[PDB]
Amino acid sequence: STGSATTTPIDSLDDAYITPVQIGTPAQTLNLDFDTGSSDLWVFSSETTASEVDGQTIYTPSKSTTAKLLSGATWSISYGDGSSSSGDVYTDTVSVGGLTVTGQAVESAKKVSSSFTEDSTIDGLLGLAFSTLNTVSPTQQKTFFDNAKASLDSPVFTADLGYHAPGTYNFGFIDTTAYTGSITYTAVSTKQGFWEWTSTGYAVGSGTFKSTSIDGIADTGTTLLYLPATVVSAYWAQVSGAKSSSSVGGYVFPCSATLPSFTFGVGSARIVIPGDYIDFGPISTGSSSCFGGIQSSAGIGINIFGDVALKAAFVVFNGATTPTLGFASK
């Protein structure tokens, strides 16, 4: 089997991407944030504290003839950005782009943090990291991909995120029309539960490539590109007037600037992030100070190849017995 679904930016900045997901019988379609940095499929629901729901579409398990309470199971997750959610668990039928999993754990939120409430466009998350990170207790549950894998034509999914435009998540096949040149594959460590790999270096604009190993994670659920302070300083030094602002929470730059591109290495291959992908717009409405899309990972504890990087590539998440990651230009 295969599946193919369009993923759409939630706003004009590509702050996140939503993908429609069918849950239950009859189907209830929710728009979920596919997140290769976590491993829980959780939804706003009829069980979510009413004051914490503000415009989201909810899953109502009592209206699904295939929903079953997973007795005694609870979940609770905290994300890198400080947000969180928790609740109980159902199993139900879940379909993405025509690919169906029966008995998928659907984690129903009883509580969500303010950041989730305040984002009316995201109805929940669909985790695509390794199932070892799943938070369900006392019996850990598998991700949608893990459940689908054996049925797929090939044990892979691909992320093809758009810049200010829709893109695609495919399951079970590689669309050879969706990228240019070849896909370069690179090793993955699953030791921390992530799609963790090592970039071979970087360049800023038309500058020379610096060969240096940068360990980080391919994370569709993180907006920005978080890299070591040395790398980030070298980037922003090429933008007149750019500075790190402790009050704002990162590098800012004059909105009148033209940003240089940023290149990262995948083996001997190179992925170029155009400068415009690095512009996250005014820090507050009407400001002429703009927020940068490349930020320091210092104090995160890990480098994160988030959407800013991934949307410059066609990315293969290869879930073979020994997982790997593939990157192509597009």
UniProtKB/Swiss-Prot annotation:
Question: Which residues form each disulfide bond in the chain?
Answer: 255-290
| Swiss-Prot/TrEMBL keywords | Aspartyl protease, Disulfide bond, Hydrolase, Protease, Signal, Zymogen
Instruction: List the coiled-coil residues.
Output: none
Hydrolase listed as a keyword: yes
A GO term, aspect molecular function: aspartic-type endopeptidase activity
Q: Which reaction does it catalyse?
A: Hydrolysis of proteins with specificity similar to that of pepsin A, prefers hydrophobic residues at P1 and P1', but does not cleave 14-Ala-|-Leu-15 in the B chain of insulin or Z-Glu-Tyr. Clots milk
Which residues are annotated as active site? 35, 199
Provide a GO biological process annotation: proteolysis
| Peptidase A1 domain segment(s) | 17-328
According to its UniProt record, the EC number is 3.4.23.22
Q: Which family does it belong to?
A: Belongs to the peptidase A1 family.
What is the protein named?
Endothiapepsin
